[PDB]
Design a protein around this ligand. Structure first.
Ligand code: HEM
Ligand code: CLR
Ligand code: FES
Lengths: 68, 471
């Protein structure tokens, strides 16, 4: 996952991935470009719900911990 | 240029006087109405000291978004004072609910791996489905027994037993037998103690422990007795499971429940595990049961919506070829109807956060360490935030206008400290309603508006008697 990348790569963003990849926050929020977006599997109802309460929302954005 | 804290509208600075007027005019069991009336009185933001505790209250989703935007890594909500006092005084090990900062984070992350993570929760499906199918069977049995082709009754007690069976099945991987004709009376005692613990919380709410000891002596005593039943029963279940695990000492490949996973592969100590088992069990019984009762009530009140949910469930069962896991991604309207049930009938009157840093809301400076409460109940009934708020309309949650649902789905809270049982609860309720919709039509004879009473959790004010017809 893109979360496990940030974790062991030791990047910057403060408190990114706070729940630690359990789809139980929305801090792993990321914005994807068009050609990468459609390449990824359908969004679960649970992810959609978390996304509606993620601040600064895009119609091309997904949760980092749910992207392989 | 933001106004100071003291300019936020308020009934006044005397907490005891404010408490006096709240009890006199509205009543402890109607705090939700108090909130509604206050926004009507003061506008979209106000402050009110009640007894010892002051809070700033908000209703506007735009302010809610700002509150959660500024949230820190280890959020704190309002702690219920009689709960805290009971645990401290009687030296009961605390779980994730009563912990803070790093010690909270440690439990939470360990628990999230077994109860929130989609890879753990997929194992809940068979365990929850078995319980719901048995609930359906109970009703078919009562219908047969009635001899009328239907069954009418208040099923609140059955719903408490259903919620208990469901939470115990996912925790222990073992059926407690609470849906059989002859029931374990010691488990029934546990169920009844949970309701009593909530109910007895209410007279002590806005008081410091020094005062509820002195003016609420009988209630405090009853409350202590309710929690004692809760801890004593939960501890027996956990200890027994611990020792049985060693008696049968076989490495299982089949899923055996949450407790098996925690005891075998967790960073949590046994004492943390046992404390959190106690909370999960107690949290599971009155929440889903009351929410499901309201759902059934809204379906009976809105027969066209009931028809559409049934039609959706039947198509999903067909399209999924019977598989529950597949089915649960094919019922968008049912899931919306659950959001819609919680909008009108929240379990939690408010959400609360203590500010970490100073924050501006509606041109008012709110200092760090202030308690801020989002009035969830008041929000759900507010016609400026929901079109025709009294109407039960699940489709509002599917609106492609994604500003109609912005910070609206707040029933389980938000962020890293949102409801720990959210996935269990969502799955338990959806599976329950799939089974009910496939099997019965639900009506209420002499349907009248059922109001709400604050019993720590919000609950229906009076009994609801359903009529079930086999479908
Ligand atoms: C209809 C079902 C339920 C509703 C509407 C509900 C609602 C809530 C709410 C509003 C919160 C506070 C969240 C926040 O501050 O952001 C909460 C927290 C909590 N819930 Fe639930 N809940 C439900 C079911 C359950 C169940 C079945 C359990 C048992 C696992 C449970 C256990 C807990 C615990 C332990 C907390 C505190 C979590 C923490 O502080 O880390 N809840 N719930
Ligand atoms: C029984 C224990 C272990 C689990 C309970 C889980 C749920 C039901 C609890 C956890 C946090 C709780 C909330 C904590 C704070 C408040 C603010 C208070 O002014 C009204 C009650 C209210 C809104 C509580 C309602 C019940 C609540 C949502
Ligand atoms: S890290 Fe919590 S949602 Fe992805």
């Amino acid at each position: 996952s893109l979360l496990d990348v940030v974790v062991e790569n030791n990047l910057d963003i403060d408190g990114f991935g706070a729940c630690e990849g359990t789809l139980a926050c929305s801090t792993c929020h990321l914005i994807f470009e068009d050609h990468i977006y459609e390449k990824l599997d359908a969004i679960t109802d649970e992810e959609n719900d978390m996304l509606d309460l993620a601040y600064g929302l895009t119609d091309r954005s997904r949760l980092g911990c749910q992207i392989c | 240029s933001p106004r100071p804290f003291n300019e936020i509208p308020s009934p006044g600075d005397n907490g005891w006087l404010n408490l006096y007027h709240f009890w006199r005019e509205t009543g402890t069991h109607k705090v939700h109405l108090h909130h509604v009336q206050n926004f009507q009185k003061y506008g979209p933001i106000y402050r009110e000291k009640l007894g010892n505790v002051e809070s700033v209250y908000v209703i506007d989703p735009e302010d809610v978004a700002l509150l959660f935007k500024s949230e820190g890594p280890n959020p704190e909500r309002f702690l219920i004072p009689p709960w805290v006092a009971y645990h401290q005084y009687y030296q009961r090990p605390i779980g994730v609910l009563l912990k803070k900062s790093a010690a909270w984070k440690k439990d939470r992350v360990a628990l999230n791996q077994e109860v929130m993570a989609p890879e753990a929760t997929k194992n809940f499906l068979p365990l929850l489905d078995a319980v719901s199918r048995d609930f359906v069977s109970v009703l078919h049995r009562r219908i047969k027994k009635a001899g009328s082709g239907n069954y009418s009754g208040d099923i609140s007690d059955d719903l408490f037993r259903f919620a208990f069976e469901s939470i115990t099945n996912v925790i222990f991987g073992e059926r407690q037998g609470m849906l059989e004709e002859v029931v374990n009376p010691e488990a029934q005692r546990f169920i009844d103690a949970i309701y009593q613990m909530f109910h007895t919380s209410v007279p002590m709410l806005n008081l410091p422990p020094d005062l509820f000891r002195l003016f609420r002596t009988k209630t405090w005593k009853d409350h202590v007795a309710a929690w004692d039943v809760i801890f004593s029963k939960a501890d027996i279940y956990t200890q027994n499971f611990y020792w049985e695990l060693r008696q049968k000492g076989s490495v299982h490949h089949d899923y055996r429940g949450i407790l098996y996973r925690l005891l075998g592969d967790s960073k949590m100590s046994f004492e943390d595990i046992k404390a959190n088992v106690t909370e999960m069990l107690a949290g599971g019984v009155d929440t889903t049961s009351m929410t499901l009762q309201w759902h059934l009530y809204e379906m009976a009140r809105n027969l066209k919506v009931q028809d559409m949910l049934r039609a959706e469930v039947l198509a999903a069962r067909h399209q999924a070829q019977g598989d529950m896991a597949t089915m649960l991604q094919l019922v968008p309207l049912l899931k919306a109807s659950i959001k819609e049930t919680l909008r009108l009938h929240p379990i939690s009157v408010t959400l609360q956060r203590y500010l970490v840093n100073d924050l501006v809301l509606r041109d008012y400076m709110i200092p760090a360490k202030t308690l801020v409460q989002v009035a969830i109940y008041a929000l759900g009934r507010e016609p400026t935030f929901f079109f025709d708020p009294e109407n039960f309309d699940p489709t509002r949650w599917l609106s492609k206008d994604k500003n109609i649902t912005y910070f609206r789905n707040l029933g389980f809270g938000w962020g890293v400290r949102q409801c720990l049982g959210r996935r269990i609860a969502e799955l338990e309720m959806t599976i329950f309603l799939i089974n009910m919709l496939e099997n019965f039509r639900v009506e209420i004879q002499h349907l009248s508006d059922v109001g709400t009473t604050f019993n720590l959790i919000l609950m229906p004010e009076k009994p609801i008697s359903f009529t079930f017809w086999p479908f």
